[PDB]
């Protein structure tokens, strides 16, 4: 099955997570995991009024990890966000990089659920989540 996520729905979930991150004073910045957490991170930054938004770029070599770009620090007083958590192969690396960081996501599948500190929506392990940035509004033929 394919789970369709629209910009509107994503923004609704992002605001729900943003409320659980109150007060805003308890945070110094947001570390968005490229590229999935870029949009979700931008939404939290706005809702919380956080101007310090850094990123972490990680690539896969095949399974090895290749930290393209790394945000400084140990993650203390920061929020690390990615769009979803499927298994935790990427989250595990993010965890050890920023042990003191508050790792959050929007969607979370059963296998990766225990790796995150907080998430908004539960998605079945066998469901593909189609994010709004991978879609667009185009002509769709009539069924009849």
């Amino acid at each position: 099955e394919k789970y369709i996520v629209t910009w509107d729905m994503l923004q609704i979930h992002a605001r729900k997570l943003a409320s659980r991150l109150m007060p805003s004073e308890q945070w110094k910045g947001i570390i968005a995991v490229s590229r999935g957490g870029l949009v979700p991170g931008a939404l939290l930054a706005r809702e919380l009024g956080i101007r310090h938004v850094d990123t972490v770029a990680i690539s896969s070599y095949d399974r090895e990890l290749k930290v393209l770009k790394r945000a400084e620090g140990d993650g203390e007083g920061f929020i690390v966000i990615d769009d979803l958590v499927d298994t935790g192969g990427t989250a595990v690396a993010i965890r050890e990089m920023y042990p003191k960081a508050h790792f959050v996501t929007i969607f979370a599948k059963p296998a990766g659920r225990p790796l995150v500190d907080d998430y908004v929506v539960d998605i079945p392990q066998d469901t593909w989540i189609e994010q709004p940035w991978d879609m667009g509004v185009v002509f769709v033929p009539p069924i009849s």
Copy 2:
């Protein structure tokens, strides 16, 4: 507890309901329940290629514990070969009335709460009795202040 429904999601449900209503040659037209069934009806008409769309206007003023139903405009026939569609069915008050006017019609809705679930021939999404549904036509994209 509110269930937000955007235009994009409504259209997805409408297209899922249209696929069940195939073929389209078995329908003579569509009767939309004004005003809630107008958009869903317009969507089905497009997907099915049906140009014959009509309406049935029903005014419902609630007085304490009793409803004052009033059919303003009425489509004709027994509903035979037609598709009567509304947006949702809460208690079934409007549904029972419609079913009475068009007994031979295939009554369908996009959403359906438990109370009215047994009163429709087909629907797409299940909704809890205590949950209110915010339709797209009652909403709009506007400025929303930051949480912080």
Copy 3:
């Protein structure tokens, strides 16, 4: 060359048109032209608080599949757009006393309507929201 109209935008135009139809009390009902004017007519009916909504289905074969009764006194005949106006002429005859309005309007059909909201070139194709959907689009790379 195409003109993409998203539901959000179509709704904004419908509201701008609704404010021009104020007061709501000066109307008896709305006659939506099937199928293009169904969604726009539904939006006006929501804003103006009009529960009396009817339809009129013409046909290209001219052919009046179904029609509302009367000359349109106190009613509003609505459609989504007016390209040439060949369909607007037929509506003018069926409902003479009706206030004909549309969302979009091209040069050739502008004089045929009483009011509209957006101006579209004669060469531009208006891709309506009901003919579209949110689907996966491959990366440009």
Copy 4:
């Protein structure tokens, strides 16, 4: 003058800019300006298939007739082989500072007003100086009371 920008429209504009940036192989990475350039920069990274996305956060502050700038965080290099992006350019003041930080960087934005149009290497939509561009992230879909 209020200019409304929905999520869909922003994505349409972003893809148009992405097509002009081809081939993607000529870029080493994208530097997004917090916070306005974050969403557009994330959209280009998707279309161009670029995983290297960094940022530069500059906090502005106004004191009557003078602006106080503060770099909260900054990317490395002169911006060589990089695409620095922001959502829009109002007076170009913010852009002039970035042009000084990243001289060899390809600076682009989605929208552009007259006062800052010459400061950007490339943009998509032209917006009047007296028009307020309401962005998607600052909006939401909520209940809107009827006109009557």
